[PDB]
Amino acid sequence: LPRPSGTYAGLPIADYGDAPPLSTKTMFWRTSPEKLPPGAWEPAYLGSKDERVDGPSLQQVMRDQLKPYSEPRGLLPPQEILDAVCDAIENRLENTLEPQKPWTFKKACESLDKNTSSGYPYHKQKSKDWTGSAFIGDLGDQATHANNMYEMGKSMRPIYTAALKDELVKPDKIYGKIKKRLLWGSDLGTMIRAARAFGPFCDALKETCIFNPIRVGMSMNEDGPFIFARHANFRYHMDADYTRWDSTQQRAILKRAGDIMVRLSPEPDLARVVMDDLLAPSLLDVGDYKIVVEEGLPSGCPCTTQLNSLAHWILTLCAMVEVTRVDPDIVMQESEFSFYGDDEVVSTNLELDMVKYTMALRRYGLLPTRADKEEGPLERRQTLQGISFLRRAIVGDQFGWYGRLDRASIDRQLLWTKGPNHQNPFETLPGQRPSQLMALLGEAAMHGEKYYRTVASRVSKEAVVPRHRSVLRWVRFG
What we know:
about 475 residues, alpha+beta, Single alpha-helices involved in coiled-coils or other helix-helix interfaces, Alpha-Beta Plaits, 4 domains, three-stranded antiparallel sheet, globular, RNA-directed RNA polymerase, transferase, RNA-dependent RNA polymerase, monomeric
């Protein structure tokens, strides 16, 4: 009956938790029983029952991920720079975004991924209470109540459920120092409220994803060429390649980003209530306890990605303004940015003082990294070729610019397929992957005949195998 107290990974305990145990299974299966090449990526660590190594508990792995959230924040950019940057960003969006209709409860509900958990308190696959058009049963009650609170402009405390990400990782993350990525799973109620509040702004942004630097919702194949052509119109190109972006975020910056989102939403008074709840100290369910996380990015909700990209835009433009002493408006005139959460490409005509720029980013608490992992300033280059975005290398030829998945990544996707959760990643799946096989064919085609022929060979062995010229033409030009 009395609330528990204490510390968990440096963070205060606020209540007992209701989260179900961390998964010990992976969705990844080998496509073949052959042994893996040396240094091959494998699914992330599965805990005490992982037959591959003896490691810590998944709870300890999770505690390791939370430690940076209790670290001190970096500094805010200088107030007059911050205000001018935020004003300039808001003004650009005002000038580009089409005003939207408010989102209905029905649109909010439909927009939700039904294949994921509803989080607190029911922790059930959303599809379990979905009829095709509405939530019913327990989730209907949660969704309706949250909708009523939204319409009343009434606050609700979001409750997040911590998980660890099942994904392919480099082998040193399994056989050396074990790491697995922290995920925040939002409660269905919060998802409904954020979807209603911020769905319109996110739609507006997605429709301008070539004109505006927030690239969320872009299609690599269809929008990439125009996006990268715009970047190519500028002299210098870079990628700061951040470590632990989400956990280094400052809530004071996120609130400035949130202010812009609220102000450009069709229901700003209702949106303000939702944003304030999103950014208030975050209750995170870690199994036995719910803890309070005051800082960093609470990444439960889909609109998270846009908020995070907007923070990124704020921080990048602050550093550039600080260093060049040029107005944010002028910097924008002389630059093309691409942001997707922590992922960026910055192109500019400005001769940036890279030492000072790197210093400024680190000042803000960020952890940019050089390609070579050395301790100096970030590098700038005069060619866009060699820079990545959304895990695709940017490539230019006589036909234009495009994003190409590298050979290691294509090779990796041939080694693994997704299926039901299981304990041993090295099991092959007894026995269909037509659309994914076609995509890999496309991607391989972009690496020329020699590499394509090998990929098509391994792809025939699994399974209609078109000629190189034909698939190349298809994947590049619609």
